[PDB]
Amino acid sequence: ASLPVLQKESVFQSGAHAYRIPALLYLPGQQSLLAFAEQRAAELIVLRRGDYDAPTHQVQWQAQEVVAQARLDGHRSMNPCPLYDAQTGTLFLFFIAIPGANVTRLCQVTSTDHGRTWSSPRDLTDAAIGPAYREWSTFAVGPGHCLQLNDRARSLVVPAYAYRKLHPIQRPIPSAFCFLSHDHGRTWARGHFVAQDTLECQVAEVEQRVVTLNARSHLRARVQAQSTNDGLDFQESQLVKKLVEPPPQGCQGSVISFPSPRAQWLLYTHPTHSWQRADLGAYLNPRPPAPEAWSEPVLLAKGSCAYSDLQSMGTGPDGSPLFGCLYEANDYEEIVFLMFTLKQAFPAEY
Numbered sequence: 607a608s609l610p611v612l613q614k615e616s617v618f619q620s621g622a623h624a625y626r627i628p629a630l631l632y633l634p635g636q637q638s639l640l641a642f643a644e645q646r647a648a649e650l651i652v653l654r655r656g657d658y659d660a661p662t663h664q665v666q667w668q669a670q671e672v673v674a675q676a677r678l679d680g681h682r683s684m685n686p687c688p689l690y691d692a693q694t695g696t697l698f699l700f701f702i703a704i705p706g707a708n709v710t711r712l713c714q715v716t717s718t719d720h721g722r723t724w725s726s727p728r729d730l731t732d733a734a735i736g737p738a739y740r741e742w743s744t745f746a747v748g749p750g751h752c753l754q755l756n757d758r759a760r761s762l763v764v765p766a767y768a769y770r771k772l773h774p775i776q777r778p779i780p781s782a783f784c785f786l787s788h789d790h791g792r793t794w795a796r797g798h799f800v801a802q803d804t805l806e807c808q809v810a811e812v813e814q815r816v817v818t819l820n821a822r823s824h825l826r827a828r829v830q831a832q833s834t835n836d837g838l839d840f841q842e843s844q845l846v847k848k849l850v851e852p853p854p855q856g857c858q859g860s861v862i863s864f865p866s867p868r869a870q871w872l873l874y875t876h877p878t879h880s881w882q883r884a885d886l887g888a889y890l891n892p893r894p895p896a897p898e899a900w901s902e903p904v905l906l907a908k909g910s911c912a913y914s915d916l917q918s919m920g921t922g923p924d925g926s927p928l929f930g931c932l933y934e935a936n937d938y939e940e941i942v943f944l945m946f947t948l949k950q951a952f953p954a955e956y
């Protein structure tokens with residue numbers, strides 16, 4: 607059986623449309639979650655707001671809505687990557703836009719009323735990427751939640767990857783990297799690539815500040831890399847044999863930091879079958895980012911499970927760290943919300 611959890615609810619399902627590519631964002635101070643996804647016939651991005659009530663151990667989700675401004679004319683919108691700027695009280699949604707040779711665009715919308723309304727999009731593509739743009743076939747952000755650092759500038763870090771046209775007889779090769787802003791998203795720089803054949807990724811900060819990057823790969827195991835200079839360079843990287851990737855070219859997964867009961871630990875979710883996208887597991891790194899220290903997975907959901915996104919939700923009703931998880935289930939017929947505590951998942955680590 608799978609781990610007892612506080613809540614398991616389908617929050618998007620196939621209907622008139624298909625739902626994929628989840629992203630989850632906790633809003634501290636609001637006891638609220640935003641759950642985003644692509645609404646495909648890709649076309650648009652939709653959002654549901656959930657209010658978390660601890661005494662009933664549950665989130666009540668409001669009605670789904672299109673993020674009408676997260677779009678460019680004649681383009682499909684993909685890869686919702688949200689971020690909450692603690693310093694401003696501003697909500698960011700990053701996304702890519704592709705027309706209905708590199709033609710992919712990086713976009714941002716912004717909200718100051720917690721996601722109820724949104725600015726008109728800004729196209730960041732030229733200023734963020736620059737001459738490199740023509741050396742890529744395409745690129746993406748996230749998908750999923752991004753990162754704010756507690757450096758002086760409270761920098762914004764958007765995980766990403768680009769397919770680089772490195773040798774003309776070879777097909778393009780993907781490498782992960784981060785977009786970086788030090789002025790609250792007014793300007794953007796491209797950090798340096800991690801390593802050949804890394805795809806979708808996410809980043810988390812631990813403590814010496816370290817940004818840990820966890821990425822999908824072509825191999826049978828995850829790639830993880832670490833930056834000591836806040837995402838500009840992931841000076842080191844390697845395979846993480848304890849973290850399996852299934853055929854043919856892996857699956858996206860999510861990583862967050864959260865405060866250590868004993869200053870942070872990591873939590874990571876991803877399908878656990880080496881053979882297929884099934885059996886969503888949670889894994890713990892209590893000595894991060896050491897790759898050796900990743901635990902054995904504990905089972906969060908049986909059956910078909912694919913992309914996920916995690917959020918730290920503060921303290922849970924049993925007093926241990928509370929987590930939210932949004933994941934694609936059941937051969938992509940739904941996106942399910944799961945809520946559970948550290949005590950429930952890793953009782954031996956408490």
Ligand SMILES: *[C@]1(C(=O)O)O[C@@H]([C@@H](O)[C@@H](O)CO)[C@H](NC(C)=O)[C@@H](O)[C@@H]1F
Binds near residue numbers: 684858
């Ligand atoms: C995931 C998927 O594997 O199901 O794949 C993404 C990839 O095709 C990519 O990472 C491999 O290059 C895809 N992203 C885009 C921009 O199409 C996701 O849509 C998909 F869910």
